Amino acid sequence: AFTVTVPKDLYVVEYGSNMTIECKFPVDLAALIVYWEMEDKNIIQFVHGERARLLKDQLSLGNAALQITDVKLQDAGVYRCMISYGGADYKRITVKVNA
Amino acid sequence: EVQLVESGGGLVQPGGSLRLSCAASGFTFSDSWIHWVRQAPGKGLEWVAWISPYGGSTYYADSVKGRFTISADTSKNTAYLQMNSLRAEDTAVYYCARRHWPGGFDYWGQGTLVTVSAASTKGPSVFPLAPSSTAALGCLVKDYFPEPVTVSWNSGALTSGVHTFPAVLQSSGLYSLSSVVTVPSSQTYICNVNHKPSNTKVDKKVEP
Amino acid sequence: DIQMTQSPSSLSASVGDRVTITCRASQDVSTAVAWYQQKPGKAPKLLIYSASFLYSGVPSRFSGSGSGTDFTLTISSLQPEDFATYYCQQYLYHPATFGQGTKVEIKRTVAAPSVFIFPPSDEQLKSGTASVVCLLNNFYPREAKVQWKVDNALQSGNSQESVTEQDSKDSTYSLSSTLTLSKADYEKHKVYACEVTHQGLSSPVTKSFNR
């Protein structure tokens, strides 16, 4: 089946710094969906090819890169990626914020 | 026993609104992906919306965008679909359905009928179709709106030989339906009718 | 969006033969398509996913194949409980789109209809109307003609038919016409009949009743 691969599941990121979370997958942008979320809150919503953004460059390489800037204590929490090109799978990731 | 129990179906006036529930269990709902597929009587299937309950990330169909708003509660563990500014075109049976990850929608809901019309409600009148002495009897469910109706026989105990027929629309704008059952000519038979809109439950003997 | 197109839209096949339901796509997908089985009054059930893979617990007789635009669901040995409307569905481009359907009726032997009738009830005759029902039970083929005669006079514009869905076991049908009259019109005529005609009946059956 279609499955998501993560390089790691726990990020430890300094306050005020930047962080790039990754959800890799095997590889049409129009067909591809990518989602990033937090508990009862949505960061990204990507269906029709369009301080937090995505790297559309990596999508050609089967990689969903969530780039956040100026990390804040409330960016701390569990993130969840969901992606699909036909088949679909989801991964969960934890982020903690240092000082 | 993965089950998606729905609710909220019934009569609505055009312009009016309706909230449908889709209560889930038997699987992690936070990690799930919930869709909505509607189906007018006689027509095929139409996808209308989905949501990711973990974050509540939604996506609607051009038909329903700006009207239908799907929400979810990962705690109480049920999805929702607030349909507003409704039309007769939106009259259909709405199914809840979770995504089978490798592909397709594996587990579906039992479905609910939402009817969009300005026609009033009216409880059915239930008449026994008395047999004459295999034997055959039944119950006539006459003059009711809207659909659906649920007719049973001995509270689900009588399944063999039963026939509940497709209700047809009369010239009075009211539906009528008959349910029968082929039965030994050689007991106590009762038709159990229930019309939710008028909130009427009828249990009627059928004596020779 | 993207269009899915099942051919044929309807089909009749006997028990034991190979059905072959085609479903084509307006856009050059690849492999991302499922197959369902919606039988009357109930929600669709999944059969195939990703074109060529069978879902858990589905009978082995259901097969899947195809890549790109053209796929096909294939039943090797059809069976009464396979009576349903089958759908295809692509799920890589979104909105996810379905076909129109493919109703499969089972082709069985001809079976004549057992004809019963029921007079109106005095309960209903307090209300001021008289409904009379005629039941055609367990027959095949589906096509059947019914007429209502009051005092041997052909009735019209006061009857409604409804026919069930093909039985999942016996593969037969059943119909229920119901003639509605005013009490003050039901009470001046005496005879009431249900003139029935069908491929299985040699001559039209007529079940009657007098008050």
Side-chain angles (χ1 to χ4, degrees), chain C residues 71-146:
Chain C
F71 332 93
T72 173
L73 167 57
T74 306
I75 313 176
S76 67
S77 177
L78 187 69
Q79 180 166 0
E81 51 262 33
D82 298 340
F83 151 72
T85 298
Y86 299 102
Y87 291 90
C88 64
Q89 175 217 26
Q90 76 84 36
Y91 53 73
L92 78 70
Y93 288 111
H94 299 77
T97 61
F98 283 94
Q100 72 286 358
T102 305
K103 190 183 80 81
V104 171
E105 176 196 327
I106 306 303
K107 182 153 183 179
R108 62 150 300 162
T109 65
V110 179
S114 307
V115 181
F116 318 85
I117 61 145
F118 318 85
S121 56
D122 235 279
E123 201 189 316
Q124 190 172 192
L125 295 168
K126 179 166 66 60
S127 61
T129 50
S131 306
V132 189
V133 184
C134 190
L135 178 72
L136 289 66
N137 191 250
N138 298 338
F139 61 82
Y140 187 96
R142 185 176 184 265
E143 38 264 36
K145 182 175 71 190
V146 183

Side-chain angles (χ1 to χ4, degrees), chain B residues 3-191:
Chain B
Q3 75 184 256
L4 290 160
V5 181
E6 315 180 24
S7 63
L11 182 60
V12 189
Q13 305 180 20
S17 318
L18 235 194
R19 181 184 53 83
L20 301 194
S21 323
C22 177
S25 74
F27 66 105
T28 312
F29 182 80
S30 358
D31 284 337
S32 86
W33 187 12
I34 306 302
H35 286 230
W36 281 93
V37 169
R38 63 182 184 172
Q39 174 177 253
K43 98 172 190 77
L45 295 166
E46 186 187 20
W47 170 99
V48 293
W50 73 51
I51 188 170
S52 181
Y54 184 67
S57 333
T58 54
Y59 180 71
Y60 313 86
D62 288 23
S63 325
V64 300
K65 168 57 194 171
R67 293 190 296 133
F68 296 4
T69 33
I70 164 160
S71 65
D73 189 15
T74 65
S75 167
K76 190 179 140 296
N77 211 316
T78 76
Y80 291 106
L81 183 67
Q82 180 65 30
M83 303 173 296
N84 69 78
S85 67
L86 275 166
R87 289 125 51 162
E89 309 90 65
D90 301 318
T91 294
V93 160
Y94 281 72
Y95 293 138
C96 174
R98 188 250 303 190
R99 166 82 175 214
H100 181 243
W101 289 101
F105 308 157
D106 47 32
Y107 288 102
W108 291 71
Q110 85 294 357
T112 207
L113 163 61
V114 49
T115 301
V116 184
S117 167
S120 303
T121 41
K122 173 52 179 51
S125 72
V126 185
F127 302 119
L129 302 181
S132 303
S133 188
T134 185
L137 54 139
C139 285
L140 176 68
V141 185
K142 176 82 166 127
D143 299 349
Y144 74 87
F145 186 95
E147 267 184 311
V149 97
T150 177
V151 179
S152 123
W153 285 105
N154 299 337
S155 303
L158 183 37
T159 281
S160 74
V162 175
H163 296 287
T164 304
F165 294 105
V168 287
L169 188 62
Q170 304 179 145
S171 59
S172 54
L174 296 169
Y175 283 88
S176 181
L177 172 142
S178 67
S179 185
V180 292
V181 52
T182 63
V183 158
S185 336
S186 346
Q187 222 128 229
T188 317
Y189 303 97
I190 296 169
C191 58

Side-chain angles (χ1 to χ4, degrees), chain C residues 10-30:
Chain C
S10 301
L11 72 89
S12 178
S14 58
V15 168
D17 54 39
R18 299 183 63 81
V19 195
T20 303
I21 307 172
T22 296
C23 161
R24 293 177 193 87
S26 63
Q27 247 256 251
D28 324 273
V29 188
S30 170

